[PDB]
Amino acid sequence: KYNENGTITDAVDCALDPLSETKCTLKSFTVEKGIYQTSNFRVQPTESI
Amino acid sequence: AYTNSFTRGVYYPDKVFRSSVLHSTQDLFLPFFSNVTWFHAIHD
Amino acid sequence: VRFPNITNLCPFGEVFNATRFASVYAWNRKRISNCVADYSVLYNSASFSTFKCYGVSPTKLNDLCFTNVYADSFVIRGDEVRQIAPGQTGKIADYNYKLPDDFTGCVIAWNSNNLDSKGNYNYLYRKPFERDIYFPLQSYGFQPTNVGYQPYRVVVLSFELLHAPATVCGPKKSTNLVKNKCVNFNFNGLTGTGVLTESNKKFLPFQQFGRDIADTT
Amino acid sequence: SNFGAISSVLNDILSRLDPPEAEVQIDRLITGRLQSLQTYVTQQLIRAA
Amino acid sequence: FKNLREFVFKNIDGYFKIYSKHTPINLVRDLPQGFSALEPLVD
């Protein structure tokens, strides 16, 4: 978040938690009441065959 | 010893002036609320 | 047209006319900065066997300018000249001298059959811009009687065009700046049309350009 | 967006490449930007309905 | 402590990039909580 003087005054770490993921998805530091689709769950492989 | 990094570790990703804007960028940043090793210089 | 009012000339002669080139296993990387880079000399010169640009066209280099320019200087065998390019693979491209596949710049080479060849056994070969200082180490015996087996002196000019303060700019004179009128501007190689006015935008000392939502200046 | 081009900025393509190469990079931007307008207009027509 | 000096050191393709910020503090025990962005100084 850049303010009127071009100074970064805040920031969101998009992988910190589900709320931060929502804030990054909506490109805002404020999230309105509701349900948002923010990402996709995918099970990762453990080893190769 | 370890401490809480909180919201520290954010730097300007490039040399472009921007203002009144929310900008999304991917770079090597210190993850928020991560653990940073705490060293001492008393009596490291 | 605006460029820093610097009159120093860039030391290309110290790279291209060097007494000795380094080996490819231990290639040199010279920094070129704080100077005027006239690329017409290198381009127009007939002494080069090749002058191939992957980044920008060679005739645009006179207008365009860079934050830094680096000259990677070393000796290879003639048939291996083809391997010094983005997207290439092979025993040289993969083992001793790798370029980024997004490399911006020009690869310039000429033979040294009348200078380095004797036999000359001082040239040894073995990530992008890595210097890797039964062995993997092999060398050439360059002799004047060996075309594809003759030594070549290759200089790779790596150009950084990221929008930041420029230090290496071409032989182009600046003009006066006119405010509050529609003009065709060129700031350090960045062009466009618009009205230039005084502003209250507090750029930080490291910032050279500002941008809008559309990524325009 | 680059759309496969070396740069999203049209002037940066033109100031760096000769026409035989600049045209290729520009065609990539034209296709992407023309497609972008078509997407916009279609959405406006549906929304207008 | 009176002075907090934050730095970032990273290496990209052989370039050692340094960012930093100096700010006054009034805290001895640990890092102060808050937000401050670091500008680049050296490459």
Ligand SMILES: *[C@@H]1O[C@H](CO)[C@@H](O)[C@H](O)[C@H]1NC(C)=O
């Ligand atoms: C910008 O800097 C001025 C001091 O020159 C200050 O008064 C103003 O509040 C600053 N603006 C913001 C958004 O912090």
Ligand SMILES: *[C@@H]1O[C@H](CO)[C@@H](O)[C@H](O)[C@H]1NC(C)=O
């Ligand atoms: C940080 O360290 C604490 C122990 O002091 C531990 O419980 C916690 O899980 C660690 N967190 C991370 C993200 O490593």
Ligand SMILES: *[C@@H]1O[C@H](CO)[C@@H](O)[C@H](O)[C@H]1NC(C)=O
């Ligand atoms: C190298 O020397 C020749 C004269 O033999 C000169 O014409 C050429 O421009 C010089 N090269 C550079 C890069 O200055």
